[model samples]
Target: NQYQLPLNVRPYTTTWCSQSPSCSNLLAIGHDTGITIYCASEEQTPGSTGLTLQELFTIQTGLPTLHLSFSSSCSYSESPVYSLFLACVCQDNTVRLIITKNETIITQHVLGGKSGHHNFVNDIDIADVYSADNRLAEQVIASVGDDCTLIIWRLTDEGPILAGYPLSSPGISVQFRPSNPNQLIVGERNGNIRIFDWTLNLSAEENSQTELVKNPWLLTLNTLPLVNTCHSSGIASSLANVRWIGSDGSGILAMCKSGAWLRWNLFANNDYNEISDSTMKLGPKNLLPNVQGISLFPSLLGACPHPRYMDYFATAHSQHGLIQLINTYEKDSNSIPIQLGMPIVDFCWHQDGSHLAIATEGSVLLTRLMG
Candidate 1:
């Protein structure tokens, strides 16, 4: 019955976000005209019988944007509250970043590759990669498209500029999970994944002891990829939503749009870095078919973010608005769904797992998560 959010009252709601620090009950919904921030107010009228959501602000993005993500929250000091960063990609093949505080956008920056994208810009991410001593590294911005390339950006006086890097096949989906910065996982349109890391660059005389990757970037990282037995090329297929399954970064969750998914237990027994892929006996794990929505269980993030309640993950099937419970209970009970009315376009959990932002065709509904 949660579809009671007055959908017809709105034009279109494509994306929703609540990942920033000051993001309390504030729900940021990306609709046809622009982004509207909403807040739940109490029933002032005796006959108020539905959600008390009220519009707080709107940031007009101009073009109809497809996807967006918020950066990890930041601090501007002497300031009482935290600020949030936004990165949105529009249909015109450009990515824009807006820094907002107290529900108002302070400044905005538009950026794209130096070479320019010929087709659509499918995905974008923003992050603050840190140095080993806990200091800030490059403030990185990234984007991917059908052109089979990924571009990284760094902020300068000239604005966000490209940190040039070549790429592989078109990225159906891409993410830079906050659980582990400096590392990105790209899921191809077909059934495959590419692990990109900004952590290290390699040399030709790389360690032979560990199977080295042909890419100079992968050499020094000493990584092992989850390869597909059969490559996925022909299909317009695209899915690469990845997250650290556990707050401790024990495993990696790779989900596809074609209902293919894999859970990699990288840290088999606390020796993740030392263990080889073969040693972990890491094979693909399967699950519900037609898996459309997936996410790493949300938890407290930052200095040392660990799993919060870390219970069963929340997922959605393409055909229904209901969310399915996986790895949460007895085998039979696990498949039951959380019935929310209306067909769902997408769903996202808050950093604290306190709220769920469900995206429908014409409305963006923000509902609280029950324990």
Candidate 2:
């Protein structure tokens, strides 16, 4: 079901290198002190190593790379080498924008220092802005951290200009909605999720010369009442990850640190505000087969939505180290669990949704759909 890559170094995070219209088979990993990129070629033979991996290049940062993601669109199309722009947050409280050529870095930008981020950054996500004529205008980076600030960065030719706002608690995750790049989804440690519209201020900042803009208004924020029955102590839990469930932005699927998942269905009103009713909850007992053992309980780590299917997603069992493909409606039926046998650190799907890259303790695995 999976092929082990040649590189033996463990990764703190795993992501696929993807762009619009076409996607490459290359996968990138964030290691302790740097970043490694791998190009995968399908063997296409029965009962053989499914895919062969080739180490393309590595970027040395001398700092532990915690979280990194590729821009959804090509950031520099005018360059002859077809560059890739990646945003990464390191353990040293630094956020970097790296542009790569064939075998080396073309340019690099750093956005953290003594006066920048005062604490560790938890998560980062990138979005590409476009002109009306369909050209790559710029890129927007969303980052959240232990400093309780949600920072929105705009990468322009001049430099990186940003606007930030303080949150009620430490921000855990931040993501730009795919359907609407102007809309931002933020999750905090207190189990609250907020939606923000930065349309007006983002345009206003572009017209101004200020390096930092004032915080804009929030559209809506809500907290889900997810109960954790796994532990008798009933400790408060935080969201490990949250994503827009559908391409149409119709729902939200979030996983709790307590090994439970909740899905909210939303409808748009006349003012285009999202309204939600009752949410569906799924625990280990609902997702896994009946088994009685202390060590067999499912500890879900993270969840990612399918690139194509709205009702399908992939979630990992932290305790068992198996990746399961799940259907939101058909809870009773699911695809066979991906057998990694090692605790999964992170995983991501290719843009086409047929290829998947998984990261375990000290190795990486790739699986391709036979159909």
Candidate 3:
């Protein structure tokens, strides 16, 4: 059965969440105040006829939680079955890590530093790198904030602690390359997309006085220019969103506040230099005069990767309150935009890309695509 959760009327930022790999009935959600999970029952349906969402259980993490993530793999039968990790970036620039097991809070870790930004952390992600054995190792946890910096830390049994990298920027979104773990992409407020290659090095040196200086370099950074140009309009240099289209490097999509959508052909050797050559205009044409103001101005809010369709992408427009799915392969054909009842702030697709979960200003809308 399908159900829809009641609309949250309180004015605040809402983040989307998903269930752990092991928890089939529990759906985790992140809020400005804290993190909560609701039990989604198959027997029950959404209170609304068309939507399917059920609220089962919820608990405050004590600290305000902004984002949540589950381990790559989680099992219900494990002894310490707490597979979910929630991060609450407090208003004071400190972060609280809430660990949960079987939908219950297990322990908490509060991490902060003296040089930390004096603002709330906006985004967080857990990065894993593959070793020679073909096994994935949890490498770092990265967080971005208004302080205009991206901080990376090492995750350990003692919990997460500050680890140093040479990279710093006014980053809004950050994601690790799923195919190549050592690489990372950062979307900045300056309308620039930056990529970094993370590495570890160790060297022993002898001083001029013949003294040996031993040191271990845990982190090294190499930054690559992804996209330097903002939207054609110079009004605001802020970027709306950037996302990896698929496992292949060739599929990268970025949107700017100037109502511009761009696709990058990373597979080409001259891709980085050809940034100026790869873009598409998404503003409303003069076709509909009745709603000209709302239709003409385009402001991208968010985007999601198509799960099963390679090189396919979808973007949400702010002014029109519409979702446009684009087939990058068919450049000549126009994109058919879908208008939702409310403004879509963010959206994500199920693993197979058949269903979409959209978080709007009023409520969350789940839609299925039928061929």
Candidate 4:
């Protein structure tokens, strides 16, 4: 079970990274050249510390890559047997979609339109919470780029189809809320957070109290007006990464160019008026010096509850290659984070959160919760 990832004939680009959803054995990685897939294999050694992964396949789409996302609805154990969907925005203002299984490209599509952003697509996600059907149903894929636009696509037998309003902004990070599927949160390079609720009916219903509208409204939740006051010149620096720290949707952790780590609370209300309630500098200052050089890999940050452990959470920091286990139930406690020391770029916990898979710049590390 414990083994290093075997080297491929074509060395993986240093910029390539990956992410996995719950209960999936497959890891989807986006590369500067194209996309690749890897399968997790249990270590042959029972008490092994780090697990091994095998590169099952690679598909060169001939596009300069930006980011990748697998559909949340793609089940690993079931059929029509849809493999993971790979979406990447290239340097040429084209979004590439590749459906894969066992490392083979089953289908590919190049979405050409206005090209949401002038630069590259930074992140992508399949809205798992918005769908109502399970069998014989296709899902929608959402992509966010440096151009500050959110584009939705419906995938079907014919191909990928574009969906609802394309939210425009200078967004760097995009994520679907786990607690509420209809809600989408976008993080901007300008240090502002916008939230959109798809379930909110803008149009007047038969007995509704809300007014009708032609488009979805991008609600400005929390504006870090002071973010510029603090980081000032580095506000547009390519070193920032935004992440939600809890599955309960209570807080967000953002890493800034000024080497500051801060957490914002969203519990007071969806309006994000509780700015004063934020915990500034939750982690060590200057955790990663000068993140500008790190291009292909944006910092990977994630948090999930420990399956069998109560009130405990785990977070992985990509730049530091560190995974920290925190006990929120404890007050005034500080513990050293578990350091893997391998420049980990991305990681995801199992559906049950009993174990986690860490993807470093060159390898994947699997660790189980000891408690």
Candidate 5:
């Protein structure tokens, strides 16, 4: 039913290579001490029941890795072995970029110069920028952290050039829009979602604090109204994660720590306040009746929308050790509950949406969903 990754320490997060189908089975695990990459195979050993993972390489970053993400496109270098770039947000208030070729680390560098985040960096995402002619131009990285600031770094041959902007509150998660890579999606710990048009004027002449504070964001979405009952008294729920529904950017899907999720369209004629009843609510419990207090009780740790399938998305049940795969628009059965037998830390879907990688306390688990 599932394959186990051989690791001794607890893993915090896991992600898959988000590019071609050739690298769909390529997995990455971020842990307390370092990051590990593995190549997963469906063909199990003679005595094994499911798939198994083969260790590709490991990098010791010396600090706890809080988040990890891989670039969508590999470097088109002269060498036969293409390089894969990984962004690691660590507990030390700095982000590290690791460039790997085959099983060796080609180069490693710390981004944002000497003045990085003053607090712990929570999440990081990498995206490729395209030119007016649609040709691949360059790659960029976006990060948010407890310092209540958003930093964008452009990957360069010598090092990373960065620009910092202040946010309304502490940031919990960040991701770039798939349809428009220049559009950055950031989720705040105070339950706010800010979509920024990240077309920065990196040229030194015009970069100033006055221009930065003007705000390059397009729109802001808040989760407080959707979860009014939970925020009745004190602190509001933190938006653990937010993602776009599909590649076309129809709308957005966001999850909070209060065990509730909100789905709404960006272009809908009505605001979320008017349509909160239908668009915002707790997850379906009727389909998963066997699981006690299915959605209203257990806290949600993180969530990810299916890469290709817009209707299907996965949510992690932190205490229940479960991954809930819910079909948003399906009438037959709304959700499928998967029992992992251990508290789930994080999870992500393969680029093709055929496999899901789950991170537990001490090991990695791979689930196959398609033939």
Candidate 6:
């Protein structure tokens, strides 16, 4: 009630990034027109201990930005010259990357994600992963669309040399593994868990500026194995916002767009065993049964940077027009769930796990959480 803001923050997408409490909490709103970053300063309002979000800046490229994600700390080089980058997928079929400081964007790149059939780009994600040889760590950026293609971008100042690959079908979502940074999980309609190796083995020290003409994800395992399809029956169900249920990626939960839910353990003694070029294994054992739902707000992507506890995570569910918490590990519905009277678009957790940035109907709300 106190932190609600009346704005056409749109639906289906939101992101939060806070490096430290000393810095202002930055909220990125991806709407139909453009993207807006709200700077919620810790400087409290008069007579109030809470903070209000002040408009920091706005950017409208004339295309509806569907998804916006703030990257984790990354360095220009191996040196500690750390910085953060932002990337958003455009309905106009493009992905834009921006370099920002103090809530202001300094540099921006309008990278092409065009599909011959004019497919609408649906999702995007960023992560730093070790190359195959474990010698290099790459700031890998990925995008997927109805075009049935996944574009992999190697983010750099000069540019991101990208490559495209035909997927089983489209609407697939891509995310890198946090517990195991070298692996990426892709949610596809095939109902199988797709994990791609992100390790290109190109160390930052190598610092080569070679533009890629093909999917490097295929190149490393190229001359080698690139993929693994695991179990999780209802696994593909919740993938509209698919993510690993456990922080270590030990298990994955796919909240079905059709209201079905399922999870599978990757270490059923799962190992990266190559079953075929197009297939591998992560040791998936079983799937969730009696999984039912109408809508879900998994405050996490595929990775949990703020895993309050091991295998512990937060989600919101819509029941007869009321919203409530659905802890995957706890399975308790008694916890106070933040009520969203209308349909929820999307929501994300601040890196510190202190706040939730949410978009519902035509408004935005911030809920501060206490561990």
* Per-model TM-score on C-alpha atoms: 0.69, 0.80, 0.71, 0.66, 0.80, 0.69
For all candidates in order, the CA lDDT equals 0.52, 0.68, 0.52, 0.52, 0.70, 0.56
Query: Which residue runs does candidate 1 get wrong by more than 4 Å?
Result: 1-4, 7-19, 40-53, 73-84, 100-106, 156-161, 202-240, 268-311, 328-334, 368-371
Tell me the deviation in Å of residue 22 in model 1.
3.3
For model 5 the TM-score comes to 0.80
Q: Pick the candidate with the highest lDDT.
A: 5
RMSD vs true structure, all candidates:
7.9, 6.6, 8.8, 8.1, 7.0, 8.3
Better of 1 and 6 by lDDT: 6
TM-score of 4: 0.66
Instruction: Put down candidate 5 lDDT per residue, 172-197, tens digits, no spaces.
Output: 88888765777788899887888887
lDDT of 1 by residue, 74-131 (tens): 4333434436577777667777777776557788777655565656776677777565
Where model 6 places Cα greater than 4 Å from the true spot, the runs are 8-12, 18-24, 43-51, 73-84, 100-106, 113-118, 129-137, 156-159, 200-239, 267-306, 310-321, 331-336, 369-371
lDDT of 1 at 230: 19
Would you list the clashing residue pairs of candidate 1?
189-237, 189-238
TM-score of 3: 0.71
Candidate 2 wrongly placed segments (more than 4 Å): 20-23, 45-51, 72-82, 204-234, 267-300, 332-336, 369-371
What is the TM-score of candidate 2? 0.80
Local accuracy of candidate 4 as per-residue lDDT tens digits, 266-348 = 43223343322332435323222111111112233434345334346555555666666666545336454467666665565
In candidate 2, list every pair of residues with a backbone clash: none
- What tens-digit string does per-residue lDDT give for candidate 6 at 184-237? 766664434466664444433124655343333431111001111212233333
Point out the worst 10-residue segment of candidate 5 by lDDT: 285-294
- Candidate 3 scores a C-alpha RMSD against the true structure in Å of 8.8
